[PDB]
Amino acid sequence: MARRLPKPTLQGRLEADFPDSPLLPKFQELNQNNLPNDVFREAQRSYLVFLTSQFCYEEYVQRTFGVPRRQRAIDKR
Amino acid sequence: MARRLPKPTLQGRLEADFPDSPLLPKFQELNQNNLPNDVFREAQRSYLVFLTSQFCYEEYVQRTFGVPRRQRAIDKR
Amino acid sequence: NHMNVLVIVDEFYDNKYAAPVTDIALKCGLPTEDFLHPSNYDLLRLELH
Amino acid sequence: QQVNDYIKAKVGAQRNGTLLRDPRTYLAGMTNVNGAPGLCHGQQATCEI
């Protein structure tokens, strides 16, 4: 009994509206075989969502530990 | 059996970071020879704290007296 | 025998199951009208002076 | 039984005295009075609630 909420208003074909991003290699692994176009577009939207969030958290991890305390004493004279 | 508190988070092996610091000539005098290595690093961290504290107290004592008569009498003349 | 308070506090609060209460801590719990009622005689037996 | 004993102790101190019946060694034998060493007012009136 899903009967979910209607989806939020969003722009179609974001993947092509921007030329390139390193998420796209992993992103192209998805392919549409059985399902119709629209359902596949929805699932692909969600997967691009997942990839963006992946990169966001991977970036936050770098930012938490990205202070080469050693480059401060070395690089300063 | 006296059980001490945990040691605080500290960046290990600071001696490798800062060379030619004027305390290092004296610091080199300490000898690990007998002890295991983590006990050596712990005790040498303590000894480095001690040496820096001695230097800071001597520098403050040099900083204590102020407004010297002879220096001002020569500089403004 | 030892000086350090670390092990004293630790070994006291390490595994404390039962927590008993002193009596003068109990007396200050009750108000006067409840204190004098003869359902609290265990304290009255020890307020002689 | 623990909470029952605690209640019976606190409520008017039914145990060890100040009670109307005498639960001790009745063995379904008889019913007796308890307490009242000396009364200086009169026949105690039963107040019900």
DSSP symbols for B40-51: HHHHHHHHHHHH
Q: How many CB pairs under 8 A join B and C?
A: 10
Q: Do B2 and C10 touch (CB under 8 A)?
A: no
DSSP reduced 3-state for B70 = helix
Q: Which residues have C-beta within 8 Å of that of residue A58, sequence separation ≥ 6? A: none
Cα three-residue angle B54-B58-B63, rounded to 5 degrees: 145
Q: Which residues have C-beta within 8 Å of that of residue A14, sequence separation ≥ 6? A: A45, A48
Q: Which residues have C-beta within 8 Å of that of residue B48, sequence separation ≥ 6? A: B14, B15, B23, B27
C-alpha distance from B32 to closest chain A C-alpha (Å): 25
Interior/surface letters A16-54, b for 16+ CB within 10 angstroms, e for the rest: eeeeeeebeeeeeeeeeeeeeeeeeeeebeeebeebeee
Alpha carbon distance C30, C44 (integer Å): 12
Tokens of B56: 């800071």
Q: Do A70 and B18 touch (CB under 8 A)?
A: no
Segments in chain A forming alpha helices (H): 14-17, 23-27, 37-64, 69-75
Burial group, residue A55, by CB count within 10 angstroms (0-12, 13-18, 19+)? middle
Touch criterion met for A and D (3+ Cβ pairs within 8 Å)? no
Match 């800071």 to its residue by tokens. Answer: B56
Alpha carbon distance B9, D45 (integer Å): 77
Alpha carbon distance A26, A58 (integer Å): 15
